[PDB]
Design a protein around this nucleic acid. Structure first.
Ligand SMILES: [Zn+2]
Ligand SMILES: [Zn+2]
Length: 374
DNA sequence: CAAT
């Protein structure tokens, strides 16, 4: 039995119009949901597959997530009980009602695990919808943003492409990174402690890997005092090159600069701080210096674990960044501890500093000062 | 992890 025999594949124009992942997208009156039900073993065809659709308004009871729940209840009565792995590709993330219904269903049934790939985040800026996605995640649903691979898979399985291959729309990768970072913020995703310790150790770097992790937070000026702005706190990393994502990669500092306009900050004074495992290369620093030159109400503070020699003009880039008003400093014990406490999935464990932390911070601080004073 |  093949997916083509299980579903009526949707029209290609229905798929592309409904699954376009522009984060802010008006005019869509419908939610689409493609799903597969599998055993514990993921290889081969699913046990069954279905496409559900429902109008957003006026009744959530006809949203495709609830249509799925009613179909799946009846389907299970007709098949021999076993453990099920369910995958959804949904055009909009769940509204508050569906999120709470699915969360209740998952939490009462240890035999079912659910992964939800979403094309767009629905009302991601509204606290009610944020809290509902957290309840769904806490019920064990794995919630991810649809990337190129999932759009292509959904095209192959659920669309009447007539053998033509999936063609990505404009800016699919840029949309993905904005949504991924936004989903991480609202789920309050914390960084793996091993990933933190490995990447923020400031001893001389000996690994062949060049990856950059970047933790960020935002403050607002209020009554001559900086106050936390808890909505936009999290971490991200560089995007490795891939011809279906960013063909030349996208460095962490640039992904961070992409986020700031997406936050829709008002005209008040803001201080945006990042803790990055590598200081920015020349290209990143130029872009960062351009940004702060053009956004006078945003103050940048950059704390770096290590100084990245890009074999080019990185020293001049750091000088330009400082000249244009960014604060640049090397992370000391206090900044390492703050990120462990704030951004890392530490499970109550205190910060344990690696060997030579203080000594390496002093050496790097002296190198930075020498760079900035030329 | 299809990898400037
Ligand atoms: Zn709903
Ligand atoms: Zn860079």
């Amino acid at each position: 039995p093949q997916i083509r025999n299980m579903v009526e594949p949707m029209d290609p124009r229905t798929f592309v119009s409904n699954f376009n992942n522009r984060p802010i997208l008006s005019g869509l009156d419908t939610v689409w949901l493609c799903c597969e039900v599998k055993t514990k073993d993921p290889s081969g065809p699913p046990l069954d597959a279905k496409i559900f659709q429902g109008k957003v308004y006026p009744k959530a009871k006809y949203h495709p997530e609830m249509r799925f729940l009613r179909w799946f209840h009846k389907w299970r009565q007709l098949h021999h009980d076993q453990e099920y792995k369910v995958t959804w590709y949904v055009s909009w993330s769940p509204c508050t009602r569906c999120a709470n219904s699915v969360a209740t269903f998952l939490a009462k049934d240890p035999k079912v695990t659910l992964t939800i790939f979403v094309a767009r985040l629905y009302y991601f800026w509204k606290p009610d919808y944020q809290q509902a996605l957290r309840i769904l995640a806490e019920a064990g649903a794995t919630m991810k943003i649809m990337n190129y691979n999932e759009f292509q898979d959904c095209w192959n399985k659920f669309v009447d492409g007539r053998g033509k291959p999936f063609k990505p729309w404009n800016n699919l990768p840029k949309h993905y990174t904005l949504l991924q970072a936004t989903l991480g913020e609202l789920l309050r995703h914390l960084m793996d402690p091993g990933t933190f310790t490995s990447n923020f150790n400031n001893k001389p770097w000996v690994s062949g890997q060049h990856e950059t992790y970047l933790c960020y937070k935002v403050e607002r000026l209020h009554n001559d005092t900086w106050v936390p702005l808890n909505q936009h706190r999290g971490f991200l990393r560089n995007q490795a090159p891939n011809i279906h994502g960013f063909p030349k990669g996208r460095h962490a500092a640039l992904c961070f600069l992409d986020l700031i306009p997406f936050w829709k900050l008002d005209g008040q004074q803001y201080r945006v701080t990042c803790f990055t495992s590598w200081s920015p290369c020349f290209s990143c620093a130029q872009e960062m210096a351009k940004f702060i030159s053009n956004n006078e109400h945003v103050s940048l503070c950059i704390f770096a674990a290590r100084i990245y020699d890009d074999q080019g003009r990185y020293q001049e880039g750091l000088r330009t960044l400082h000249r244009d008003g960014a604060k640049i400093a090397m992370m000391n014990y206090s900044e390492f501890e703050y990120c462990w406490d704030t951004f890392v999935d530490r499970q109550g464990r205190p910060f344990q500093p690696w060997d030579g932390l203080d000594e390496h911070s002093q050496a790097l601080s002296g190198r930075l000062r020498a760079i900035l004073q030329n």
